[PDB]
């Protein structure tokens, strides 16, 4: 060792804490409600809702989580110390990525159900969206993640790396991000070895898997932003509009 161990196991604690505070839903509560499923009747009610409702509905629920991700970023060690521009670039292109990762906690894999609006629901509540291929791609993603059996610490560190990405275009102080990214990579790897969990590094999904999903989302949005342009202009939360233009 040449790097300060005290400094790196400080970062591990800092990241895990910043996530712990901005974890939105506490896990024990997310788990105990896994026996709280949408009835066959309730599900039908969702899929016979209108596309411009299910979009407006989800776009609010999404922006709900995204807000917490922003808080995570702010409390993240050495994130604010970055340039104001870079600070935006990472959050804008990365916030949606983080949420998709966080979903695996609200996703039970035994029944392939996500915790949506109070209860667990299947892939087909979101039938009314018209982008039911992207939904399947999302559920498949959260399945692979749920298969890895992440700890809450590993979620904390993984999502941290998801946000801090120097390979994101538009970065002014790129070299500044590279350094921060590396220390977080070191911290993640150290914690995995501290816990014999090094095996999952290869099991992690490719960097392009979330590149696909997040862009596939903004693709189906531009469709909706054209079908119901006045709806997204008047109803959709501004933060959502700002991020997904």
């Amino acid at each position: 060792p040449y790097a300060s161990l005290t400094e790196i196991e400080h970062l591990v604690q800092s990241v895990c804490k910043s996530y712990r505070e901005t974890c939105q839903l506490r896990l024990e509560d997310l788990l105990r409600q896994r026996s709280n499923i949408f009835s066959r009747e309730e599900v039908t009610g969702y899929q016979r809702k209108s596309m411009w409702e299910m979009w407006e509905r989800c776009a609010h629920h999404l922006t709900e989580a995204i807000q917490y991700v922003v808080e995570f970023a702010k409390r993240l060690s050495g994130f604010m110390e970055l340039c104001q521009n870079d600070q935006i670039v990472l959050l804008k292109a990365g916030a949606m990525e983080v949420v998709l990762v966080r979903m695996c906690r609200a996703y039970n894999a035994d029944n392939r159900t996500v915790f949506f609006e109070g209860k667990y629901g299947g892939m087909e509540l979101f039938r009314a969206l018209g982008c039911s291929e992207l939904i399947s791609s999302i559920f498949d993603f959260s399945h692979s993640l749920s298969a890895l059996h992440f700890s809450e610490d590993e979620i904390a560190l993984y999502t941290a790396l998801v946000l801090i990405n120097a390979h994101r275009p538009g970065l002014q102080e790129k070299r500044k991000v590279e350094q921060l990214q590396y220390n977080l990579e070191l911290a993640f790897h150290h914690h995995l070895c501290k816990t014999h969990r090094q095996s999952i590094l290869a099991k992690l999904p490719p960097k392009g898997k979330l590149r696909s999903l997040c862009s596939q989302h903004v693709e189906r949005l531009q469709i909706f932003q054209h079908l119901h342009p006045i709806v997204v202009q008047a109803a959709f939360p501004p933060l959502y509009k700002e991020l997904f233009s």
Binding site: Q67, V70, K74, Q84, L91, K92, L239, E242
Partner: peptide
């Protein structure tokens, strides 16, 4: 700007 507001720019 809203994102800028959320941070403090």
């Amino acid at each position: 700007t809203l994102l800028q507001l959320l941070l403090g720019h």
